[PDB]
Amino acid sequence: VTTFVALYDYESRTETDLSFKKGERLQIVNNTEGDWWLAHSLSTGQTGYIPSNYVAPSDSIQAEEWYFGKITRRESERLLLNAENPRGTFLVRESETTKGAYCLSVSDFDNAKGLNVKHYKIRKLDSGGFYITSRTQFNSLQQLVAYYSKHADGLCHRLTTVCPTSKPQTQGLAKDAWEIPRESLRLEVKLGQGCFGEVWMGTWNGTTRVAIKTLKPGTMSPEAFLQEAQVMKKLRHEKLVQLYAVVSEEPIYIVTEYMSKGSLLDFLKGETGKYLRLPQLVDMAAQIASGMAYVERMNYVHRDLRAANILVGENLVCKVADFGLARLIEDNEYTARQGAKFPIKWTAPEAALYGRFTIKSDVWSFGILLTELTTKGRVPYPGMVNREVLDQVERGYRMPCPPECPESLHDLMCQCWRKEPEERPTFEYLQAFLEDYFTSTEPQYQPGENL
Ligand SMILES: C=CC(=O)N(C1CC1)[C@@H](C(=O)NC1CCCC1)c1cc(F)cc(F)c1
């Protein structure tokens, strides 16, 4: 057995789990898998279950504050470019492209490019040591990071601030927490009204901040929902709002990861919103596409993808919410894809006409969402009304490229609107197309040739 070190405070919720503060020494049995592990605190003496993502071995590279694991290139830039981060804010991560190399990412400022991240490959020596340039080597990553925190010696900037992060969200409210009773949940601020319920900020067991969706009675069966949520429960992805739990007594409450800065449509309208440029819009659309790509890999269907059901967080993280919920609603109008409650303008016509909701109808929607993203939230088909959008779409019509949308993107929307589902692109493609939309020249990594 290995002592692990805590990387974040975790305020004990239930009986059976453990409170600990960042730094505590915890004892666990090596070969454990799963999301919740059994720990004995050699610090506190207390014992319980802990979320496995909140610890790392003692004295291993992972243990360090600045070590961000196998986070992605595109997402490290998200965290580093936070505008409160001084120059020299850094992190260390695993390289996505060179088998076992690590990579040091560092914020800098440049007259041409503004504030930008510079990525340095760190290769491991025959000695187990580490080097950014052959000229300057160490026996460990920690020595390396120490040294460049004192002089840039080649680096764009001396390392100053460990990259600031947030506590990850655990995977579940605690071990064995799926269905919970109303009284564990406290509704504090109500956040908005839907067509079939409300959305709330709240707290579970007086500790964890949660979102709480409350369903209007008669909307779905609590039976149908629960059997559905055995599926949703399994969809874990960093761009899907995580489904924590549920109260299966009418009225259904659905407990979800709190998203701090609200719906995407809201956020696009209104300030912090009126001034985003395309490369951040396109980075948002790529985040949604990575969420939907996982949905795609899991043979699932969202059924109401659009900006109103994307939530936004810190640093413009975007996440897909309320997936596969819309199927279970019983409102004989809505289910007919009729009425004031049905997003006809985002609905692929085969869904509108034949209930044929599939991952490809979700690709249609995604194309509409791209117009929402390039208009800062303007309604789609602006001159039309809903009652008329079906005929017009079945008769061949499509949206002209919004003013101020690069035609390369608009032609992507047009693949999303191709008449025959099976010739619309996949989400894998939509994801790769957008994480690579802007092509610079060679400086992928800084050449450590000699610095
Ligand atoms: C009528 C417009 C609307 O807001 N919808 C309707 C589907 C269009 C909301 C909705 O009512 N949400 C309420 C239930 C819990 C919180 C508030 C909705 C969005 C989805 F992504 C999936 C759903 F199943 C439902």
Q: DSSP secondary structure string, 144-165?
A: HHHHHTT--TTSSS---SBPP-
Our answer on whether the CB atom of 309 is closer than 6 Å to any ligand 1 atom is yes
Residue minimizing CA distance to atom 2 of ligand 1: 195
- Whether 194 has a binding-site annotation, put simply, is yes
CA distance 97 to 91: 17
CATH class label, 182-257:
alpha beta
How far is residue 109 from each of residues 76, 153, 283, 378, measured CA to CA in Å? 16, 17, 21, 35
CB count within 10 Å of CB 424 equals 23
**The token pair that represents 85 in the structure block:** 């981060």
Sign of CA dihedral 201, 378, 286, 112: negative
Q: Which residues contact 50 (CB under 8 A, 6 or more apart)?
A: 6, 10, 17, 18, 20, 26, 28, 36, 37, 38, 39
Domain ranges of the chain: 2-60, 73-148, 182-257, 264-435
Q: Is 82 helix (H, G, I), strand (E, B) or coil?
A: coil
CB count within 10 Å of CB 202 equals 20
Q: Tokens 């001034």 identify what position?
A: 275
Phi, psi at 37, each rounded to 5°: -120, 155
Q: 118 has which bridge partners?
A: 106
Our answer on whether the CB atom of 215 is closer than 6 Å to any ligand 1 atom is yes
Residue minimizing CA distance to atom 6 of ligand 1: 195
Asked if residues 285 and 291 have their Cβ atoms less than 8 Å apart, the reply is no
Q: Is 176 left (phi over 0), alpha (psi -120 to 50) or beta?
A: left
Measured in whole angstroms, how far is the alpha carbon of residue 180 from the centre of its chain?
A: 25
Identity at 129, one-letter amino acid code = G
**The token pair that represents 272 in the structure block:** 């912090």
Q: Cα 114–116–117 angle (5° rounding)?
A: 170
**The token pair that represents 274 in the structure block:** 């009126």
**Residue 182 C-alpha to ligand 1 middle, in angstroms?**
21
Pocket of ligand 1, candidates 214, 232, 322: which has the most ligand atoms within 8 Å of its Cβ, to mutate?
Answer: 322
CA distance 365 to 342: 13
**The token pair that represents 231 in the structure block:** 């599926």
Q: Is 253 helix (H, G, I), strand (E, B) or coil?
A: strand
Q: 202 has which bridge partners?
A: 187, 210
Q: Which residues contact 74 (CB under 8 A, 6 or more apart)?
A: 283, 286, 435
CA distance 137 to 142: 12
Experimental method: X-ray
Closest Cα partner for 349 from 417, 415, 301, 296?
417
- Whether 379 has a binding-site annotation, put simply, is no
Q: What is the CA radius of gyration of the chain?
A: 24
Query: Considering the domain 73-148, what is its CATH architecture?
Result: 2-Layer Sandwich (3.30)
Provide the pairing of β-strand 208-215 with 197-204.
antiparallel
Asked if residues 215 and 252 have their Cβ atoms less than 8 Å apart, the reply is yes
Provide the pairing of β-strand 318-320 with 310-312.
antiparallel
**Residue 315 C-alpha to ligand 1 middle, in angstroms?**
26
Asked if residues 119 and 97 have their Cβ atoms less than 8 Å apart, the reply is no
- Alpha helices by DSSP H, listed for 349-426, are 349-354, 359-374, 386-394, 407-416
**CB-count burial class (<10 Å; 0-12, 13-18, 19+) for 226:** middle
Q: Is 266 left (phi over 0), alpha (psi -120 to 50) or beta?
A: alpha
Resolution in A: 2.7
How far is residue 35 from each of residues 32, 141, 271, measured CA to CA in Å? 9, 28, 39
Identity at 202, one-letter amino acid code = G
Closest Cα partner for 7 from 17, 20, 22?
22
Asked if residues 55 and 32 have their Cβ atoms less than 8 Å apart, the reply is no
Q: Which residues contact 277 (CB under 8 A, 6 or more apart)?
A: none
* Equal fold, 73-148 vs 182-257: no
Asked if residues 128 and 121 have their Cβ atoms less than 8 Å apart, the reply is no
The CATH code of domain 264-435 reads 1.10.510.10
- The CATH T-level fold of domain 2-60 is SH3 type barrels. (2.30.30)
- Rounded to the nearest 10°, the torsion over CA 277, 283, 288, 291 is -170
- Whether 385 has a binding-site annotation, put simply, is no
CB crowding 154-172: b at 16 or more within 10 Å, else e: bbbbebebbbeeeeebbeb
CA distance 71 to 92: 9
CB count within 10 Å of CB 135 equals 12
**The token pair that represents 331 in the structure block:** 């409102």
Q: Is 392 helix (H, G, I), strand (E, B) or coil?
A: helix
